[PDB]
């Protein structure tokens, strides 16, 4: 009833003053600068605040993004852009890059970078809930929702905003297309993990569970692959997590697939399926150790005992023994040589990311207030 989600560190940024000195001339332009500065500061604080919930994040985030949106969007022409886009330099670290910062003087860069941190916050809020031994039903649902929210933010950043950046991200950086895509995919896989647990707890047909498990594994595999063109040094830890989870959930698939075969009086085949489940599980059991010995971003962990990791282990043995027992007095069936092949159905959509858009430009931005800027120095 608990999950373990590897998390990379949050991004950090230089505090930004929004002080333009002689540029800004007027009470109104000054006020909007203070409101930007303070809304940003409050938002940044929430990322590390333990009392923060999804409501506060959205509330603080909207407050900032709506003000920040005045540096990006035109007030009238949808084909134009704020004259203020380049007024302010923003500086950010990157998820795989440690403390090595990167900077752009582009307000669009800030919007994507901060939004990316908002998305990560949601994945970290989810993973914190997923680790509570006492996690309740509502908390699990929130884990699922939060990951879907995160998926949608990352994706929105990628599709409609990333292409505005005049300096593309360097390989391995958070604002790059390939990396950001892996986060979307991982979120889906992680969120689908929660779904599977409910289906299992709720006693759903084994065909459904097996298929959902298999699709979950596939997502993890795609994420693993998506990152695979990165330098191995700083991706190695993360890819180990994804690959471990991939192997781990394939075992889940073989396990529940065995039930389907056994229920069909194909018990010989069922036994063979469970044997493959043991293998996949052992591979996962090996990979989860390498992760613990592999250096890279985030705290060190040694995945074996998670209530999730051990349950599949008990399920596999009991499900395997059940099959062979049936085989010994009932079926008397041969154990096939080759592992069974997996269905690969189309998407079930249970994993659809919740669409995200930034809020509209704050109504504090008016042509008069905007007029109180630049003036040319």
């Amino acid at each position: 009833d608990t999950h373990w989600f590897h998390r990379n560190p949050l991004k950090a940024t230089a505090p930004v003053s929004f002080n333009y000195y002689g540029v800004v001339t007027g009470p109104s332009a000054s006020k909007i600068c203070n409101d930007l500065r303070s809304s940003r500061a409050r938002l940044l604080e929430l990322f590390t605040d333990l009392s923060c919930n999804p409501e506060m994040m959205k509330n603080a985030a909207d407050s900032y993004f709506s003000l920040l949106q005045g540096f990006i969007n035109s007030l009238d022409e949808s084909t134009q852009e704020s004259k203020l886009r380049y007024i302010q330099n923003f500086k950010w670290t990157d998820t795989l890059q440690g403390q090595v910062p990167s900077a752009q003087q582009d307000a669009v860069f800030e919007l994507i970078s901060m939004g990316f941190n908002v998305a990560l916050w949601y994945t970290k809020y989810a993973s914190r809930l997923a680790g509570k031994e006492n996690i309740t039903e509502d908390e699990a649902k929130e884990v699922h929702r939060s990951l879907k929210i995160a998926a949608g933010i990352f994706k929105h950043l990628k599709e409609s905003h990333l292409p505005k950046l005049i300096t593309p991200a360097e390989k391995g950086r958070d604002l790059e297309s390939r990396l950001i895509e892996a986060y979307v995919i991982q979120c889906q896989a992680e969120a689908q993990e929660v779904t599977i647990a409910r289906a299992i707890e709720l006693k759903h047909a084994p065909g459904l569970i097996a298929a959902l498990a298999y699709e979950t594994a596939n997502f993890y595999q795609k994420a693993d692959h998506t990152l695979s063109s990165l330098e191995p040094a700083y991706s190695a830890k993360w890819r180990k997590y994804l690959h471990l989870k991939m192997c781990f959930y394939t075992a889940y698939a073989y396990c529940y697939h065995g039930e389907t075969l056994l229920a069909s009086d194909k018990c010989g085949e069922a036994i063979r399926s469970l044997q493959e489940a043991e293998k996949l599980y052992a591979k996962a059991e090996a990979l989860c150790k390498e992760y613990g010995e592999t250096k890279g971003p985030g705290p060190t962990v040694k995945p074996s005992g998670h209530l999730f990791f051990r349950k599949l282990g008990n399920l596999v043995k009991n499900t395997l023994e059940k099959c062979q027992r049936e085989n010994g007095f009932i079926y008397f069936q041969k154990i096939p040589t080759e592992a069974p092949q997996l269905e690969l159905k189309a998407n079930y959509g249970l994993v659809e990311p919740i669409p995200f858009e930034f809020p509209p430009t704050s109504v504090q931005w008016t042509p008069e207030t905007l007029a109180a800027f630049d003036l040319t120095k």
Binding site: R145, T195, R198, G207
Partner: peptide, 18 residues
């Protein structure tokens, strides 16, 4: 047989809530 389909809904509703 057909049970698998019936169940599929119960998840869609659980997930399609929030």
């Amino acid at each position: 047989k057909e049970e698998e389909d019936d169940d599929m809904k119960e998840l869609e509703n659980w997930a399609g809530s929030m």
